[PDB]
Amino acid sequence: ASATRVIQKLRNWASGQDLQAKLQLRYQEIAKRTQPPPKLPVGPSHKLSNNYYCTR
């Protein structure tokens, strides 16, 4: 992403593809390495009634 415009035009002409739109090196678009804590949902059997195991 630090390539000069001359080298970018040279690479794009040599490959035939617009390489700068789809770079194979990740710079900033990736997720942050620290994330907010999750709160995972519970399954369908997490209920206090009508949940006898013989019926499922």
Partner: protein, 430 residues
């Protein structure tokens, strides 16, 4: 007949219910006890059992089982073991004082009934297991028994009928579970008050491993009057299959809480408005009624308008007639708190032998305390219903059923009250 109630004083059995006459032998003989009891005993076992059967008397204990069939379960030839009549005089159940009243006021009726039932079933003795807290009642019972022994009504010549019968009085030591049949048998035998499983039934293996029959004080006390006046009269009182008179203990939010004797199938509204002086604040101020002691569920005012006081009528009303203990709660009653206090009673009075009643009744007590505080969510209502259904029918004795039924009644009728308490708690905390 179609309408029942308005029992006449000449037809009331317990003529000294209020202690206004002499409770001793002279007053009892003036009131008509111990009359032709020798002739009854010479008529013998089969005639007495037929009289009970044609009277159609059902168990005043709260079980509701027929008395004639239950007593004819012991109409068998002896296999060398002695046979025993055992009289449930514990009266542990809340709301109920009728056995106390008739023990301290008509004890000679109880003694004569012990003799009649023991002769009918074939028995050398009747052990009256009285409640441990009823010390004065037990002492009055012993005074009456000493009078009967001195008069020759009891002991080695039962009123001169060449029949030997002894009446013992054994005091409990404070356990509601000892009012149960088999637990009472164990308590007499000297162990803890833990009910034993059936089979064997007590008519086969009971107290001291002998054939025995446990019967309520009211049942035993109305036995000799039934024999004297015939079973057709007692069957003529009450509805079909719910026959005779009954001692009702009306307590709670009524103007005159009292013990009265009234015919079976009396309307509940009629009984309250006639003998209890009505609900405090009026029939519109009535909220709920527990009609058969704590073991029966509650019924709201809407079905209390027209319900009768029968076993079958209360079964149709999704209740039971237990000890005929009518506990009345008005609009100011914290109904959830009252039911939780009942569940706390059952938690303190469980004998702890068997797992569903032990663990589940403690669990239901904790859940009901949180319901009173509002500290739950409405899914726990259905959870508590399922816990009650797991307790009911899975226990050794019927204390589990008698603890599951009030919870079921509260959930069945006053569910929006529980949801409103939970919502108010939730909005006042969050």
């Amino acid at each position: 007949k179609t309408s029942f109630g308005s029992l006449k004083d000449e037809d009331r059995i317990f003529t000294n219910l209020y202690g206004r006459h002499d409770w001793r032998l002279k007053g009892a003989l003036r009131r008509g006890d111990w009359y032709k009891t020798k002739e009854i005993l010479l008529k013998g076992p089969d005639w007495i059992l037929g009289e009970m059967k044609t009277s159609g008397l059902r168990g005043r204990g709260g079980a509701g089982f027929p008395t004639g069939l239950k007593w004819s379960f012991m109409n068998k030839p002896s296999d060398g073991r002695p046979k025993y009549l055992v009289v449930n005089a514990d009266e542990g159940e809340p709301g109920t004082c009728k056995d106390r009243e008739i023990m301290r006021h008509d004890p000679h009726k109880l003694v004569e009934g012990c003799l009649v039932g023991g002769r009918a079933m074939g028995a050398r003795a009747a052990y009256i297991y009285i409640r441990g807290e009823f010390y004065n009642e037990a002492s009055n019972l012993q005074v009456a028994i000493r009078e009967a022994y001195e008069a020759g009504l009891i002991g080695k010549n039962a009123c001169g009928s060449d029949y030997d019968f002894d009446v013992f009085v054994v005091r409990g030591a404070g356990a509601y579970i000892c009012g149960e049949e088999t637990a009472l048998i164990e308590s007499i035998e000297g162990k803890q008050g833990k009910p034993r499983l059936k089979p064997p039934f007590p008519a086969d293996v009971g107290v001291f491993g002998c054939p025995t029959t446990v019967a309520n004080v009211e049942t035993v006390a109305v036995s000799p009057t039934i024999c004297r006046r015939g079973g057709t009269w007692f069957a003529g009182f009450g509805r079909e299959r719910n026959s005779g008179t009954k001692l009702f203990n009306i307590s709670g939010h009524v103007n005159h809480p009292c013990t009265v004797e009234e015919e079976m199938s009396v309307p509940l509204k009629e009984l309250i408005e006639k003998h209890a002086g009505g609900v405090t604040g009026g029939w519109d101020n009535l909220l709920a009624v527990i009609p058969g002691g704590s073991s029966t569920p509650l019924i709201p005012k809407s079905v209390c308008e027209t319900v009768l006081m029968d076993f079958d009528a209360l079964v149709q009303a999704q209740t039971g007639l237990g000890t005929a203990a009518v506990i009345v709660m008005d609009r100011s009653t914290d109904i959830v708190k009252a039911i939780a206090r009942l569940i706390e009673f059952y938690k303190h009075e469980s004998c702890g032998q068997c797992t569903p009643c032990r663990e589940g009744v403690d669990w239901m007590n904790k859940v009901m305390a949180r319901f009173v505080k509002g500290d739950a969510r409405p899914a726990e209502i259905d959870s508590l219903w399922e816990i009650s259904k797991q307790i009911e029918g899975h226990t050794i004795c019927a204390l589990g059923d008698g603890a599951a039924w009030p919870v079921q009644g509260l959930i069945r009728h006053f569910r929006p009250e529980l949801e409103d308490r939970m919502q108010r708690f939730a909005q006042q905390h969050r």
